[PDB]
From a paper:
Plant vitamin C biosynthetic pathway contains conversion of D-mannose-1-phosphate (Man-1-P) to GDP-D-mannose (GDP-Man), a step catalyzed by the Man-1-P guanylyltransferase which is commonly named GDP-Man pyrophosphorylase (GMPase). Arabidopsis thaliana VTC1 is the first genetically characterized plant GMPase and has unique properties when compared with bacterial and animal homologs. Structures of two GMPases have been reported, which are the crystal structure of GMPase from the hyperthermophilic bacterium Thermotoga maritima (TmGMP) and the cryo-EM structure of human GMPase (GMPPA-GMPPB complex) that is arranged into a dodecamer. These structures show that an oligomer-forming monomer (protomer) of GMPase consists of two domains: an N-terminal Rossmann fold-like domain and a C-terminal left-handed β-helix (LβH) domain. VTC1 dimerizes via its LβH domain and forms a dodecamer in crystal.
The 3.0-Å product-bound structure was solved based on the unliganded VTC1 structure. Different from the unliganded structure, the overall structure of product-bound VTC1 has a threefold symmetry with each asymmetric unit having two dimers. Six dimers form a dodecameric assembly in shape of a three-petaled flower. The two dimers within an asymmetric unit bind a total of one GDP-Man, two inorganic PPi, and two citrates. Specifically, the stalk protomer binds a citrate, the middle protomer binds a GDP-Man and a citrate, and the inner and outer protomers each bind a PPi. The two dimers can be aligned with a root mean square deviation of 0.49 Å. Their superimposition demonstrates that citrate and PPi bind to the same site on catalytic domain. The product GDP-Man binds at the edge of the central β-sheet. The oxygen at guanine C6 forms a hydrogen bond with the backbone amide of Gly85, the guanine N1 forms two hydrogen bonds with the side chain of Asp80, and the hydroxyl groups at C2 and C3 of D-mannose form hydrogen bonds with the side chain amide of Asn173 and the backbone amide of Gly146, respectively. The pyrophosphate moiety of GDP-Man is flanked by, but not directly interacting with the catalytically critical residues Glu195-Lys196, Asp111, and Asp219. It makes direct polar contacts with the backbone amide groups of Gly9, Thr12, and Arg13, the hydroxyl group of Thr12, and the guanidino group of Arg13. PPi binds to the same site as citrate, but in the inner protomer, the interacting residues differ from the afore-mentioned residues in that Gly9 is not directly involved and Lys23 replaces Arg13 for ligand recognition.
Residue numbers in the entry: 1 to 164, 166 to 366
Write the structure that this text describes.
């Protein structure tokens, strides 16, 4: 059984984090983004995973090479030449997805986080004997996504419309399970899976949708990255609560790597992820933030609703809030305030950053 992960490019919308590591390698909840999906694929018996990418794969071959041996799984890159769309790279990796076993393959959107009930999706797939299965989840604004109108009891989808006028409340969750026959409806040309391939399969009465249990989020923009960690950590509390840390210094759900250190007098939480090798000194306040590998938060600093990149340094009594994104190896001096700062890697912040909402929503004029 095979799987393909639609990655895309390096990730412009996630700068300055993606100036150091490509989109699938950026840490989410203390492990590289791509590992959340590769681990879920291995759990259901996938033996090879193809990364449909846009860039030179040498930059991430060192990362995957250890995870290949560690997870006992094969990872190959399928770099495209020209923009092939969302169904194009499915045909560019036709030789890698079809081994002759006749078994279906998974297709995952790399920007999507969920619980991945792939085992239940596999038995759902065999039950209806259809050509393609897709996961669906409800949202409040089904207009920024692609609505899947479907019939109950069977799950057969009736149409796959994109950028719709309320046509339904279920949307494509970016988790596909496709039979080998799907690859016959895709040419080796730029083609869109949501506009062409899925409507065809629905017309042939062979497209089925399964309601996705649990959380779902498309972490494209860093604002959704903060919301994504909250939903993930809530899922972790329900499935395996012992993986979250607790104590008098903890409020809500906090995920601390085993090699991180927390000094006395801290107040960490809610919705905080502290990466490996981190040093949180005394009297630090962290909330709704991601602290990546190897950063140091000095005494009495207060970080909220922000993302501190790898190997950054936050000075004593520094105050970081309101979606501040620090790149790799950013040094924030003592007693500095940052509101909405977006700092390129390796920079030293010696002056305050003042980009509040009232400031930005007033500079429009
Ligand atoms: N190999 C390759 N990958 C691409 C390309 N274009 C986009 N991708 C990647 O495929 C994924 C889909 O991203 P978009 O093309 O921007 O579509 P979308 O607006 O985000 O919406 C789609 O995803 C939602 C999440 O499941 C769906 O809800 C929605 O229905 C739709 O399928 C992303 O990870 C993107 O990097 C391409 O030309 N080639």
């Amino acid at each position: 059984m095979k799987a393909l992960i639609l990655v895309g490019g390096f990730g412009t919308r996630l700068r300055p984090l993606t100036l150091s590591f490509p989109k699938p390698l950026v840490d989410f909840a203390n492990k590289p983004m791509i590992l959340h999906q590769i681990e879920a694929l291995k759990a259901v018996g996938v033996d090879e995973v193809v990364l449909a990418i846009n860039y030179q794969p040498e930059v991430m071959l060192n990362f995957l090479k250890d995870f290949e041996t560690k997870l006992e799984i094969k990872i190959t890159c399928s770099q495209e030449t020209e923009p092939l769309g969302t169904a194009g790279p499915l045909a560019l990796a036709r030789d890698k997805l079809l081994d002759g076993s006749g078994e279906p393959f998974f297709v995952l959107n790399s920007d999507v986080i969920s619980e991945y009930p792939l085992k239940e999706m596999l038995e759902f797939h065999k039950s209806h004997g259809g050509e393609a299965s897709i996961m669906v989840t409800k949202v409040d604004e089904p207009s920024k996504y692609g609505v899947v109108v479907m019939e109950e009891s069977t799950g057969r989808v009736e149409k796959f419309v994109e950028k719709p006028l309320y046509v339904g409340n279920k949307i494509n969750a970016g988790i596909y399970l496709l039979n080998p026959s799907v690859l016959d409806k895709i040419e080796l040309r730029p083609t869109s899976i949501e506009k062409e391939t899925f409507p065809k399969i629905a017309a042939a009465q062979g497209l089925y949708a399964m309601v996705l249990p649990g959380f779902w989020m498309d972490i494209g923009q860093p604002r959704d990255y903060i919301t994504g960690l909250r939903l993930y950590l809530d899922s972790l509390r329900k499935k395996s609560p012992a993986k979250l840390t607790s104590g008098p210094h903890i409020v809500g759900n906090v995920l601390v790597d085993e090699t991180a250190t927390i000094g006395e007098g801290c107040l960490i939480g809610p919705d905080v992820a502290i990466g490996p090798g981190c040093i949180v000194e005394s009297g630090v306040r962290l909330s709704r933030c991601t602290v990546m590998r190897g950063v140091r938060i000095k005494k009495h600093a207060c970080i909220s609703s922000s993302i501190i990149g790898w190997h950054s340094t936050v000075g004593q009594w520094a105050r970081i809030e309101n979606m501040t994104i620090l790149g790799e190896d950013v040094h924030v001096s003592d007693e500095i305030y940052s509101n909405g700062g977006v700092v390129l890697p390796h920079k030293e912040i010696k002056s305050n950053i003042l980009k509040p909402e009232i400031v930005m929503k007033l500079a429009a004029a």
